[PDB]
Design a protein around this ligand. Sequence first.
Ligand SMILES: COC(=O)c1c(C)n[nH]c1-c1ccco1
Ligand SMILES: COC(=O)c1c(C)n[nH]c1-c1ccco1
Ligand SMILES: CN(C)c1ncnc2nc[nH]c12
Ligand SMILES: CN(C)c1ncnc2nc[nH]c12
Lengths: 208, 208
Amino acid sequence: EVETFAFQAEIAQLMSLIINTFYSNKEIFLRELISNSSDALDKIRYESLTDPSKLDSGKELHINLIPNKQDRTLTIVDTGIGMTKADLINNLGTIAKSGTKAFMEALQAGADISMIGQFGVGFYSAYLVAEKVTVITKHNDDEQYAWESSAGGSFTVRTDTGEPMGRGTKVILHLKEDQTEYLEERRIKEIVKKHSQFIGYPITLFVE
Amino acid sequence: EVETFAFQAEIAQLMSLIINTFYSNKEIFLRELISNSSDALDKIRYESLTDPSKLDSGKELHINLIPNKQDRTLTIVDTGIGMTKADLINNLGTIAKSGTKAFMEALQAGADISMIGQFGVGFYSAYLVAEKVTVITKHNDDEQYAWESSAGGSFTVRTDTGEPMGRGTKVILHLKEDQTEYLEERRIKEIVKKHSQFIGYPITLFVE
Ligand SMILES: COC(=O)c1c(C)n[nH]c1-c1ccco1
Ligand SMILES: COC(=O)c1c(C)n[nH]c1-c1ccco1
Ligand SMILES: CN(C)c1ncnc2nc[nH]c12
Ligand SMILES: CN(C)c1ncnc2nc[nH]c12
């Protein structure tokens, strides 16, 4: 069963801005997603010090970058803390409303699209390069979900019946037809080397 | 009763490096502490969406910068999530060991002291400008503590019997005698305007 939800008007606005504004420096989407994964991994690691059983769903704390040309997807996989249904539908959600607003205001004031991360909404930078984003995620306290949006003002969530992931998050970027350079090994290596050099987790770039 | 603890050898190393290395761009300590406060405020705000009673210890989410020339202190106050005794003594602690190591390695490799934040140990940047740091903190689940260190390989923790703070963290920087410019309104304003422009919380600079 697939549930369909309306983004709040402000997030829809933001998504449309990212999609519509002419902005050539798109590569920053990857720094933002890697950094999102890094924060999710910090959080699970932190929680684990006071409750070791939080790691029963897997001990390795890592980030995998997985390009697939047949499918035209770039997937960022982490084993961080994962997201609950309430995060997907409500909490993220509420936090994104105020980051959006602040980010909008700063843009009017000459700030730049690359600064999206300072406003806690870097995940939406994925729409610089993706026509569709699917997010698979498993939190310890909850079941595995698939969230999905091509923007246009709505998203879906359903319980996921794919390969079970243990704990973590997979962001599957369905790339715009003119953004396939982000499937290329030397392009991804360049981008990681330039913006994500000091991430405190191993980042494995899978080959095709 | 005052408990005295030994820093792990690696944190002592890091503290000594920050204290000893010739490095003129000291102002970055303030961006790091403001950013620490911002993350503590994000965390309490996040937790509050699933448990509103977490805010019974105060609803305002803010950052105050308080200079005092008589005392020669600059205090960064937040109402974020606060720290428990276990954070002070163990958890921070364990997380700082690996950030330290990575930060050490990057420095050998030509990275710069200003990059300390990428390695989760920006709090120690306070020793660029402070001969002594006192940290007062209250977490919902625990009592109010005073932590204190002048480096030299040890720190103390005691239960604090000062003004009760509700919930949050006060970082009191006892400034080195040659670092009093950080007590000055126009200097602090300059620094906040330059490095902390987009923080998503009101930052009030108190006057003397
Ligand atoms: C990995 O997914 C996300 O970050 C996400 C989803 C699925 N909804 N809203 C968000 C979000 C909005 C702002 C920060 O995160
Ligand atoms: C506000 O205080 C701190 O950040 C703190 C204290 C009191 N111990 N270790 C830390 C710390 C080490 C690394 C990140 O945080
Ligand atoms: C909210 N948000 C950005 C996220 N939450 C949990 N795990 C994630 N992995 C990548 N992004 C994540
Ligand atoms: C670990 N750490 C950096 C901190 N934890 C909780 N509250 C804080 N306020 C400033 N820094 C904080």
